[PDB]
Design a protein around this ligand. Structure first.
Ligand SMILES: *C/C=C1/C(=C/c2[nH]c(/C=C3[NH+]=C(/C=C4/NC(=O)C(C=C)=C4C)C(C)=C\3CCC(=O)O)c(CCC(=O)O)c2C)NC(=O)[C@H]1C
Ligand SMILES: *C/C=C1/C(=C/c2[nH]c(/C=C3[NH+]=C(/C=C4/NC(=O)C(C=C)=C4C)C(C)=C\3CCC(=O)O)c(CCC(=O)O)c2C)NC(=O)[C@H]1C
Lengths: 492, 492
């Protein structure tokens, strides 16, 4: 297939801007109808409505719903879609010409989109008691890491998927597999970083708007929507809220290279932001019923509330020590020292732990104290002059080479710097050094996880962890603390 | 019943120390057996095992379990209690002599306590779909108050109880009904405060250790345990973890005076502390099956995670404004003012909102600026001298009359004070005033809610809301901010 392979590479070149909200096709495990709200007129029908119910879709567009499903089910749809906002709709079931259908409904641009998901008898009390077990296990978690492990364990026990991973999204948009629960004889993926380019902006927005994303078969033929454009608005149908939505061929190829054919992702949303994802993968095609969809949907909602709760508690817990460390340091700031900055040199370990760093360097006059893993003293000496040329009290930068061109000589040692200085003319100040993030990541050919790691290792060169608000508050508070005793010596 | 009424009043005098973990009796809606772990020997049996299964309890103590329930169910108990920790036990059912039994099991001091709860056929898919509806509704909540209202609405829709209330426990142990969802033609209870004496320490500890407390009938005759003391340890049985536990007669009388006969409380626990309670009440006797117990148990676990998450977010959101207000104030601290404290007088509203207060009073030399709802200037003038006699930088007190005897003259106006002063000799400082909590509470004869309100109104006299850690941090930060520019004027 030279023609197909050549056309495929066109999509690979332009993947960050491809419209995935309007694929024009749906996955084959169901039908999609567009209905006008008053009259339930057929505007767009799927192309698999000929292999199911045996209705030719060419002339099936433009008639009423009762002609394709029966008068009774058409009236049922009339009743359930009569000004209900389609937020709380019970489980509907239909049986047209001997096939089992589940009805889902939503509204997209003054049009009723109705999905008829096929339920197979082969796929078809304990779940009610299971939910309590899971909630108690999640409540019993003390640390965030233990919460991740128990969550992946429980979700794999429920779904039976061969792999379950939890991805966290960092401050720069990159992803990190923090938890993993996989079947035996399968590749391990913990501690793997993929770039933000792997999940485009449209995919991120759809994940933020949709709690569940199900791909029951990677090797699937997309079913076109007939007609391709909506007759009412002369535009393509917005499938952003539909479960039967076509998957991009790039992601299907990526999943096939990962050895998975069935995927099930639960979005994790905190404060309206995508904190991460729960990705479930299976080697063989798998179909998830409604009884398992709602249980996994409840997992993401419970986990998001629990993760948000335990993240803020750790935020407060970490910076209570910052206040204690700041108050503790403020005492040695006036203990038998001609210079204020000579006091913190006695406890270098307490200085680094205040903000979080690997090396600190105290500068005074023509003398530099090098503590911890820090650059050469001639490098720190040269760094200080340019770094206090702007006159800022505390200067923070997690990408030194972006603004300091000679800063690439010590990317491994010091890529993030925190400043502090005083308006007195004599050379002074302390410098914190934060190392590259790549050095703390250890993980064991076009679209593969081993290739996304290489792209992350190139896109995240010379970038340290971003200085937290508490980290810049601790430096700002210590500067005012160092200014108080330094300016008190002005009297004497 | 003069003898009963006289003996009842003895319990009312001593209610804060009555042992409720060892009542020696169980509620009649079930049986209680104590079993030795190896041999399943009967040590303690309930007294209603004669009205059910027709077995005399006098000689029934000291034999094996199979003699009372059958060999098959005895072996079932053997299997399910064979080193399982009794944490994750499925729903067991038995049918002895034509009665339906549900088996619950736990361990109390090297003894297997087994409860045979009676299930009535008269009392005996939608719940699975209901849980998702509830979780989505709870996730859709934006404010804490809206969360409370949606929670009480949903729990009343589920259980059908005639009343549902949410109690929050304050810093001093008092309770407050913050949410209410009641049936028509019933007394309203929102904004009612009951003292900490209403719920003793033992009851609070049991609620912290038990998620659910069910009293299906207030007018119930306690069923004694025969024998009354455990033969193994020569002590009474610890019923702290048993659902079939006797209710104190004081609480039964209190519930009868409230017009409720069936009660169902779900404990709300955050960080291992009892944040509050979800109390459900019914006018007529009601029995809750296991299918409804686990659903309500899931409510408290989800609500506790959500309340804890949204409380910390509001904690951070409130004090981000404190940092902004502190930084904003620090700018006017050096804007054309001979005295540092003369600058904050121009924006009294920004001063009060920094910590949360109703009146502020700026003191300098022989002149006092009275702003907001504050005491008389002669009272503030006299207050300042004693209040800075200790030399503390910032003095906080939510009970002024406890340490300032002449402070009862303005309990309504200023009962909580926040201090700030500088080591300079001239009289200086700002004073924040926080009013009594009783003035902001408006709610429309021995054990009644209208009487617990009176006890709270007496026990909480002259007590303001406790100064938060941010409130004392804002005053401490402004003192250092006021010291910087004041001590900078020492140079010039
Ligand atoms: C520029 C476009 C590209 C692209 C598009 C794309 N990706 C997704 C979904 C992905 N892709 C993920 C990539 C990974 N990186 C890893 O390290 C691993 C495994 C360890 C994976 C799978 C990824 C995590 C997601 C989100 C899935 C989830 O769990 O929710 C989409 C969305 C497709 C959809 O139908 O939802 C698109 C359009 N992928 C590329 O590789 C680049 C070329
Ligand atoms: C000194 C002993 C006393 C006492 C004992 C007692 N109380 C409870 C449980 C209560 N009592 C509550 C009191 C209320 N205050 C109010 O304003 C309202 C109504 C608006 C009530 C009901 C209260 C809230 C609880 C907790 C119930 C819940 O919802 O969980 C117990 C525990 C009994 C048990 O079996 O659990 C005891 C021992 N009550 C008194 O009034 C004083 C004399």
């Amino acid at each position: 297939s030279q023609l197909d392979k050549d056309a495929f590479e066109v999509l690979l070149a332009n993947c960050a801007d491809e419209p995935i909200q309007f694929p024009g096709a749906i996955q084959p495990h169901g039908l999609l109808f567009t209905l006008k709200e008053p009259e339930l007129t057929i505007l767009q029908v799927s192309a698999n409505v000929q292999s199911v119910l045996g209705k030719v879709p060419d002339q099936l567009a433009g008639q009423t719903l009762d002609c394709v499903l029966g008068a009774g089910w058409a009236e049922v749809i009339r009743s359930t879609s009569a000004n209900d906002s389609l937020v709380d709709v019970p489980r509907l079931l239909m049986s047209v010409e001997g096939v089992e259908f589940e009805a889902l409904l939503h509204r997209s641009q003054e049009a009723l989109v109705l999905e008829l998901e096929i339920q197979d008898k082969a796929a078809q009390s304990e779940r009610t008691g299971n939910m309590g077990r899971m909630l108690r296990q999640l409540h019993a978690a003390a640390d965030l890491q233990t919460l991740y492990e128990v969550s992946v364990r429980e979700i794999q026990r429920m779904t039976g998927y061969d792999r379950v991973l939890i991805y966290r999204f960092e401050e720069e948009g990159h992803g990190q597999v923090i938890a993993e629960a996989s079947a035996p004889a399968m590749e391990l993926f913990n501690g793997l970083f993929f770039p933000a380019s792997d999940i485009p902006e449209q995919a991120r927005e759809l994940y933020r708007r949709n709690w569940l994303r199900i791909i029951p078969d990677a090797n699937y033929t997309p079913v076109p929507l007939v007609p391709q454009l909506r007759p009412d608005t002369q535009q393509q149908l917005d499938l952003s809220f539909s479960t039967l939505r076509s998957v991009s061929p790039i992601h299907c190829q990526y999943m096939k290279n990962m050895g998975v054919l069935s995927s099930m992702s639960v979005s994790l949303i905190q404060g309206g932001k995508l904190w991460g994802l729960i990705s479930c993968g299976h080697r063989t095609p798998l179909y998830v019923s409604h009884e398992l969809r709602s249980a996994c949907q409840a997992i993401g909602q419970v986990l998001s509330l629990q993760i948000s709760a335990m993240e803020a508690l750790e935020v407060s817990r970490q910076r209570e020590t910052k206040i204690q460390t700041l108050q503790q340091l403020h005492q040695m700031m006036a203990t038998s020292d001609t210079d204020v900055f000579d006091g913190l040199a006695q406890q270098p370990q307490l200085l680094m732990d205040l903000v979080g760093a690997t090396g600190v360097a105290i500068i005074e006059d023509r003398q530099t104290h090098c503590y911890g893993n820090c650059p050469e003293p001639s490098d720190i000496r040269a760094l200080h002059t340019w770094m206090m040329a702007g006159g800022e009290p505390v200067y923070a930068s997690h990408h030194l080479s972006s603004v300091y061109p000679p800063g690439e000589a010590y990317q491994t040692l010091a890529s993030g710097v925190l400043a502090m200085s005083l308006p007195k003319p004599v050379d002074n100040g302390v410098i914190w050094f934060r190392p590259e993030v790549k050095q703390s990541v250890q993980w064991s050919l076009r679209l593969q996880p081993r290739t996304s790691f290489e792209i992350w290792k190139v896109e995240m060169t010379g970038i340290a962890t971003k200085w937290s608000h508490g980290d810049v508050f601790a430096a700002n508070d210590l500067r005012r603390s160092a200014l108080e005793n330094d300016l008190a010596r002005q009297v004497s």
